[PDB]
């Protein structure tokens, strides 16, 4: 860091292309980090969701659901059952008679 | 089932099949017109053609 004596320089933070480069770099870095990771394509299935049986305060009513969904397994000829606790924001109602929600 | 001329007999086929959906365990019957050049005969109990 070298101080410049007797130098006046006109700045404009809204014309600074360093922000555009930082934005593009963070998008590219995020996408490159996320790409070589586990895809959840097999988990886009219908879920049977019910209410959480623990002690729920007045503000948390309807925020969590205890959902069950059959899933896949290391082998391709078998399946499994996976109970899990989801936030209401992460699931959406679907139109069915057997399952209640889908992952958003 | 539309009106065609003699030169186009057999050129276009109405083909039905079971396609997947966004959900992994929910299929969907579909029906689509294909050109004959885009399909190949394949004999089965319930099917006649497959994509070339």
């Amino acid at each position, epitope marked *: 860091e070298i101080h410049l004596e007797n130098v006046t320089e006109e700045f404009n933070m809204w014309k600074n292309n360093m922000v555009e480069q930082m934005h593009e770099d963070i998008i590219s870095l995020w996408d490159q980090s996320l790409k070589p990771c586990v895809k959840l394509t097999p988990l886009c299935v*219908g879920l*049977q969701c019910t209410n959480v049986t623990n002690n729920i305060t007045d503000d948390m009513r309807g925020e969590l659901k205890n959902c069950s969904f*059959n899933a896949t397994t290391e082998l391709r*000829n078998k399946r499994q059952k996976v109970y899990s606790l989801f936030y209401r924001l992460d699931i959406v*109602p679907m*139109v*069915d*008679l*057997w*399952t*209640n929600y889908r992952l958003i | 089932t539309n009106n065609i001329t003699d030169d186009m007999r057999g050129e276009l086929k109405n083909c039905s099949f079971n396609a997947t959906t966004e*959900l992994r*365990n*929910k*299929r*969907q019957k579909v029906y689509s017109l294909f050109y004959r050049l885009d399909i190949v005969p394949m004999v089965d109990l319930w099917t006649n053609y497959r994509l070339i």
Partner: antibody
Amino acid sequence: VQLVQSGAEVKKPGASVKLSCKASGYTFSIYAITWVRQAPGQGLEWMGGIIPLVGITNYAQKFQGRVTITADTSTTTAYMELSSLRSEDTAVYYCSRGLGPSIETEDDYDYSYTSEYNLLHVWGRGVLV
Amino acid sequence: LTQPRSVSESPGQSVTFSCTGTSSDIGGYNYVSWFQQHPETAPKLMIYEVSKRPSGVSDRFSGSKSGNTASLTISGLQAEDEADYYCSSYADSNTLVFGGGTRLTV
């Protein structure tokens, strides 16, 4: 398309029952079986249903703790267990079949649902309980 | 889901009747079923979803739907139609509902 009911006993307060619906004439494992309550001279009320192979239920909001529908694919028989009936809602209980397959196994047990919401066809006879 | 309790008309006169509800029962989804229950016997499926028919049904019993109200017309009404006509539909929270039953006296 043959649905043969079993169990037609009216019981005293405190009782619980298990009714059965034997099925034949169609591929048992791929069609839904549902239960409908006549109510004592009132309109119909939906109780629930099951897909035998998978074994998945959707009990209604009023029966979500009482009714227990099950199915046996080896004997091709559907069962419904009704706890804590007491003497209320004495009714004729009916067993119904789906219009078409709900799941559809090509081969093996890759079920694949078919979005059929007409699960009330071949409406079998009922039993008064 | 509700419906009129009874309708009469007369033998030979085509009779129409309907069931009503909200958008979550009849308006959307397009899955409205009707059943004809004769006394001391199981209800018979008649209309499937809007305007269809399980084979074996004379003169189709074709229906219609508009807004949140679904209806059916029985053309060529006979004495054999003295039955309780029920309306049912898919309702939200992934359930089925039924109406109270319409008694057709012919």
